[PDB]
Design a protein around this motif. Structure first.
Motif, PDB file in Angstrom:
ATOM      1  N   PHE C  25      10.846  80.463   6.931  1.00 20.42           N
ATOM      2  CA  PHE C  25      11.804  80.197   5.884  1.00 20.42           C
ATOM      3  C   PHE C  25      11.277  79.154   4.891  1.00 20.42           C
ATOM      4  O   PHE C  25      11.512  79.253   3.704  1.00 20.42           O
ATOM      5  CB  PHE C  25      13.113  79.722   6.479  1.00 20.42           C
ATOM      6  CG  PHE C  25      14.131  79.363   5.457  1.00 20.42           C
ATOM      7  CD1 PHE C  25      14.802  80.361   4.763  1.00 20.42           C
ATOM      8  CD2 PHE C  25      14.360  78.036   5.141  1.00 20.42           C
ATOM      9  CE1 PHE C  25      15.681  80.037   3.759  1.00 20.42           C
ATOM     10  CE2 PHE C  25      15.235  77.703   4.136  1.00 20.42           C
ATOM     11  CZ  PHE C  25      15.896  78.698   3.437  1.00 20.42           C
ATOM     12  N   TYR C  27       7.921  76.209   3.989  1.00 20.08           N
ATOM     13  CA  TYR C  27       6.605  75.689   4.287  1.00 20.08           C
ATOM     14  C   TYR C  27       6.404  74.366   3.564  1.00 20.08           C
ATOM     15  O   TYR C  27       6.539  74.305   2.337  1.00 20.08           O
ATOM     16  CB  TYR C  27       5.548  76.696   3.822  1.00 20.08           C
ATOM     17  CG  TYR C  27       4.165  76.162   4.028  1.00 20.08           C
ATOM     18  CD1 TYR C  27       3.577  76.231   5.273  1.00 20.08           C
ATOM     19  CD2 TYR C  27       3.475  75.498   3.007  1.00 20.08           C
ATOM     20  CE1 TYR C  27       2.352  75.658   5.505  1.00 20.08           C
ATOM     21  CE2 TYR C  27       2.236  74.921   3.234  1.00 20.08           C
ATOM     22  CZ  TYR C  27       1.695  75.004   4.493  1.00 20.08           C
ATOM     23  OH  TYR C  27       0.512  74.384   4.771  1.00 20.08           O
ATOM     24  N   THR C  28       5.948  73.356   4.297  1.00 14.25           N
ATOM     25  CA  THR C  28       5.735  72.038   3.713  1.00 14.25           C
ATOM     26  C   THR C  28       4.397  71.475   4.160  1.00 14.25           C
ATOM     27  O   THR C  28       4.035  71.614   5.318  1.00 14.25           O
ATOM     28  CB  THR C  28       6.850  71.053   4.199  1.00 14.25           C
ATOM     29  OG1 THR C  28       8.128  71.493   3.715  1.00 14.25           O
ATOM     30  CG2 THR C  28       6.619  69.634   3.682  1.00 14.25           C
ATOM     31  N   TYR C  76       3.477  82.439   5.481  1.00 15.92           N
ATOM     32  CA  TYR C  76       4.651  82.108   4.695  1.00 15.92           C
ATOM     33  C   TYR C  76       4.672  82.874   3.367  1.00 15.92           C
ATOM     34  O   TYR C  76       5.647  83.540   3.027  1.00 15.92           O
ATOM     35  CB  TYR C  76       4.687  80.615   4.367  1.00 15.92           C
ATOM     36  CG  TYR C  76       5.762  80.306   3.349  1.00 15.92           C
ATOM     37  CD1 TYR C  76       7.107  80.410   3.700  1.00 15.92           C
ATOM     38  CD2 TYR C  76       5.445  79.958   2.032  1.00 15.92           C
ATOM     39  CE1 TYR C  76       8.111  80.213   2.763  1.00 15.92           C
ATOM     40  CE2 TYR C  76       6.461  79.758   1.066  1.00 15.92           C
ATOM     41  CZ  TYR C  76       7.783  79.878   1.462  1.00 15.92           C
ATOM     42  OH  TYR C  76       8.806  79.690   0.583  1.00 15.92           O
TER      43      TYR C  76
ATOM     44  N   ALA D  75      -0.024  79.341  -4.841  1.00 15.42           N
ATOM     45  CA  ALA D  75       1.398  79.322  -5.117  1.00 15.42           C
ATOM     46  C   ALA D  75       1.605  79.764  -6.557  1.00 15.42           C
ATOM     47  O   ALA D  75       2.491  80.561  -6.874  1.00 15.42           O
ATOM     48  CB  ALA D  75       1.978  77.924  -4.903  1.00 15.42           C
ATOM     49  N   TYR D  76       0.765  79.250  -7.435  1.00 19.78           N
ATOM     50  CA  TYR D  76       0.860  79.643  -8.827  1.00 19.78           C
ATOM     51  C   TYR D  76       0.732  81.161  -8.934  1.00 19.78           C
ATOM     52  O   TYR D  76       1.533  81.840  -9.586  1.00 19.78           O
ATOM     53  CB  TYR D  76      -0.248  78.986  -9.649  1.00 19.78           C
ATOM     54  CG  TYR D  76      -0.345  79.565 -11.053  1.00 19.78           C
ATOM     55  CD1 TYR D  76       0.647  79.314 -12.001  1.00 19.78           C
ATOM     56  CD2 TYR D  76      -1.378  80.434 -11.406  1.00 19.78           C
ATOM     57  CE1 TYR D  76       0.616  79.902 -13.248  1.00 19.78           C
ATOM     58  CE2 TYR D  76      -1.417  81.026 -12.662  1.00 19.78           C
ATOM     59  CZ  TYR D  76      -0.414  80.768 -13.576  1.00 19.78           C
ATOM     60  OH  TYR D  76      -0.447  81.368 -14.802  1.00 19.78           O
ATOM     61  N   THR D  78       1.075  83.559  -6.782  1.00 15.62           N
ATOM     62  CA  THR D  78       2.115  84.384  -6.160  1.00 15.62           C
ATOM     63  C   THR D  78       3.507  84.129  -6.698  1.00 15.62           C
ATOM     64  O   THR D  78       4.466  84.728  -6.229  1.00 15.62           O
ATOM     65  CB  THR D  78       2.161  84.201  -4.620  1.00 15.62           C
ATOM     66  OG1 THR D  78       2.360  82.812  -4.314  1.00 15.62           O
ATOM     67  CG2 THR D  78       0.862  84.662  -3.983  1.00 15.62           C
ATOM     68  N   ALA D  80       5.251  81.794  -6.149  1.00 10.75           N
ATOM     69  CA  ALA D  80       6.020  81.202  -5.079  1.00 10.75           C
ATOM     70  C   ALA D  80       6.911  80.090  -5.636  1.00 10.75           C
ATOM     71  O   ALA D  80       6.469  79.254  -6.418  1.00 10.75           O
ATOM     72  CB  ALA D  80       5.086  80.642  -4.053  1.00 10.75           C
ATOM     73  N   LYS D  81       8.159  80.054  -5.208  1.00 13.17           N
ATOM     74  CA  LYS D  81       9.115  79.050  -5.665  1.00 13.17           C
ATOM     75  C   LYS D  81       8.847  77.674  -5.021  1.00 13.17           C
ATOM     76  O   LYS D  81       8.814  77.559  -3.801  1.00 13.17           O
ATOM     77  CB  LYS D  81      10.516  79.544  -5.317  1.00 13.17           C
ATOM     78  CG  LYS D  81      11.664  78.864  -6.026  1.00 13.17           C
ATOM     79  CD  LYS D  81      12.923  79.708  -5.839  1.00 13.17           C
ATOM     80  CE  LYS D  81      14.170  79.060  -6.408  1.00 13.17           C
ATOM     81  NZ  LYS D  81      15.365  79.929  -6.191  1.00 13.17           N
ATOM     82  N   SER D 100       6.970  71.219  -0.749  1.00 14.82           N
ATOM     83  CA  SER D 100       7.783  72.075   0.118  1.00 14.82           C
ATOM     84  C   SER D 100       8.108  73.326  -0.720  1.00 14.82           C
ATOM     85  O   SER D 100       8.305  73.227  -1.929  1.00 14.82           O
ATOM     86  CB  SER D 100       9.085  71.406   0.584  1.00 14.82           C
ATOM     87  OG  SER D 100       9.986  71.180  -0.484  1.00 14.82           O
ATOM     88  N   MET D 101       7.995  74.506  -0.106  1.00 17.18           N
ATOM     89  CA  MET D 101       8.269  75.785  -0.768  1.00 17.18           C
ATOM     90  C   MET D 101       9.314  76.539   0.036  1.00 17.18           C
ATOM     91  O   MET D 101       9.228  76.612   1.268  1.00 17.18           O
ATOM     92  CB  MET D 101       7.000  76.638  -0.828  1.00 17.18           C
ATOM     93  CG  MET D 101       5.871  76.049  -1.682  1.00 17.18           C
ATOM     94  SD  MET D 101       4.475  77.208  -1.763  1.00 17.18           S
ATOM     95  CE  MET D 101       3.520  76.619  -0.403  1.00 17.18           C
ATOM     96  N   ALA D 102      10.315  77.058  -0.658  1.00 23.26           N
ATOM     97  CA  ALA D 102      11.382  77.799  -0.015  1.00 23.26           C
ATOM     98  C   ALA D 102      12.137  78.619  -1.050  1.00 23.26           C
ATOM     99  O   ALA D 102      12.133  78.272  -2.235  1.00 23.26           O
ATOM    100  CB  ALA D 102      12.322  76.823   0.674  1.00 23.26           C
ATOM    101  N   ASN D 103      12.901  79.593  -0.551  1.00 21.79           N
ATOM    102  CA  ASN D 103      13.726  80.516  -1.333  1.00 21.79           C
ATOM    103  C   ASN D 103      12.959  81.319  -2.375  1.00 21.79           C
ATOM    104  O   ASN D 103      13.529  81.537  -3.461  1.00 21.79           O
ATOM    105  CB  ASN D 103      14.875  79.770  -1.991  1.00 21.79           C
ATOM    106  CG  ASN D 103      15.806  79.120  -0.979  1.00 21.79           C
ATOM    107  OD1 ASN D 103      15.991  77.899  -0.989  1.00 21.79           O
ATOM    108  ND2 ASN D 103      16.429  79.930  -0.123  1.00 21.79           N
TER     109      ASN D 103
END
Ligand SMILES: O=[N+]([O-])c1cccc(O[C@H]2O[C@H](CO)[C@H](O)[C@H](O)[C@H]2O)c1
Ligand SMILES: O=[N+]([O-])c1cccc(O[C@H]2O[C@H](CO)[C@H](O)[C@H](O)[C@H]2O)c1
Ligand SMILES: O=[N+]([O-])c1cccc(O[C@H]2O[C@H](CO)[C@H](O)[C@H](O)[C@H]2O)c1
Ligand SMILES: O=[N+]([O-])c1cccc(O[C@H]2O[C@H](CO)[C@H](O)[C@H](O)[C@H]2O)c1
Ligand SMILES: O=[N+]([O-])c1cccc(O[C@H]2O[C@H](CO)[C@H](O)[C@H](O)[C@H]2O)c1
Lengths: 103, 103, 103, 103, 103
Positions: C25, C27-28, C76, D75-76, D78, D80-81, D100-103
């Motif tokens: 859910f 990732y940090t 993730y 992250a960039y 993809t 990713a939020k 931290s990445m989520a949602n």
């Protein structure tokens, strides 16, 4: 400083360019002793290797060798088209010196 | 210098080829002490390991060992079909010496 | 040699398997001094960490610690389903020892 | 040991959490002497850096800095939020301590 | 400390920003001795290189040089749009100092 793979290849003895313009057909890697290498082939039967690191390689090359293998692995898994390959003619299979990819 | 996984595999004792032609079903990795390793299985099939760097391994193999686990991880994630595995069969589960991938 | 994460986990004291069968859910990761670690959570609230390398670890574990963080990040980002985690339950959050991923 | 980026961030001086909950707008990377850093921005204009590895970083932080750049780059790519960033505020742009990445 | 690639570029002599706003057309990587480098092109014929680590570089740059090559490869594969390139214009091909990606 070369501006392309062909010119770069030409600065070395017994090297030659192989124009493939096709994705890699098969990818093989080994961790076996004295056979820590990678081999790739194209549907036409062409086969190339990324030699085992050795004395024939200078220090600056060792990291570039690891990189080439990362490159080949990913190009394979993504079906990235390989335009050309610069290789040493004095090894069987021919050893990879450089690679160029283009859509 | 071999030109395919079969010939390479034939260069060692206690080895064999496992023809899978199937993507990896599960991937397990452990950072636990003396069990730093990766383990993969195939659907309704065998389990394979990448051995923990032991005394049995020559220094050149270490990086290749790290590379093989990365390869297994990405092939799994990407669901890349594995063609064949060359493994040591005097180990259990059979230990991976090399891998070929082709569609 | 263990053939699965459960058998591997049981080979150590203070461990236990957590079955998730779900994507990560959150990732940090941190680069802050003495807190160079990663933390992940699941929809159910379960929180786990990849411990900061320390004296509890043996040298062979250093690279494995780095590999596990690579694994969690990509898992993730690709929403790979995590089957189980073998963790050390004498740390908070529970410290990951191994991970298994299956579709 | 902290269990989330917020609690981790609070263990240090001159830090603060920025809650983005957004994908990265731009990613910049530099190999220029004494400016081997990375810069990212979000559509709302916020700009953050991953400092050049220096005397202010303990050894253990070195690998983590490199890791952080890899993370931001993927992250960039993809989209990713990014949920939150823990940053050092005694720097301009604010320097990333954790993500931290989520949602 | 610079907050964008342009300001960063302006900090050095013999540099310039090339605004591409386009995906990389070709990627070329070499492991050949004294030519361990990467070369990219854009459809407009623009050529750039990541220099072979040399005397002109300080130690702190070796790492950034490798990451840059990592970056150029993943961007080419993902066909990500390169916004700008900060280059030293006193080399042929122009040597990449920095890269930015947005949009
Ligand atoms: O790879 N070699 O060159 C080589 C030479 C001689 C023996 C040999 O097998 C031994 O080591 C391998 C890893 O090398 C495996 O652990 C086998 O299960 C072990 O018995 C391997
Ligand atoms: O991995 N081992 O071989 C091994 C042997 C003996 C104890 C042991 O657990 C100890 O170290 C691990 C990290 O390794 C965790 O930090 C545990 O929380 C700590 O208690 C681990
Ligand atoms: O990370 N730490 O353990 C730690 C301890 C004490 C101070 C501290 O901040 C200092 O170093 C970091 C990088 O670490 C940034 O450059 C800050 O802007 C600088 O002030 C960091
Ligand atoms: O990066 N620097 O701090 C820095 C300081 C002074 C000069 C300088 O340029 C020189 O070196 C770079 C690699 O750094 C390129 O090869 C240039 O073409 C070369 O002339 C770079
Ligand atoms: O790369 N170089 O700068 C360089 C300079 C001189 C010779 C040379 O070839 C030799 O080494 C390469 C690996 O480098 C291959 O193994 C060749 O098959 C071997 O003949 C390579």
């Amino acid at each position: 400083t070369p501006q392309n793979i062909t010119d770069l290849c030409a600065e070395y003895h017994n090297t030659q360019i192989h124009t493939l313009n096709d994705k890699i057909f098969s990818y093989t890697e080994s961790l076996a002793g004295k056979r820590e290498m990678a081999i790739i082939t194209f549907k036409n039967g062409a086969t190339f290797q990324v030699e085992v690191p050795g004395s024939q390689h200078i220090d600056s090359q060792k990291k570039a060798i690891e990189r080439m293998k990362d490159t080949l692995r990913i190009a394979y898994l993504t079906e990235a088209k390989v335009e050309k390959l610069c290789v040493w003619n004095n090894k069987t299979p021919h050893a990879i010196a450089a690679i160029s990819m283009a859509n």
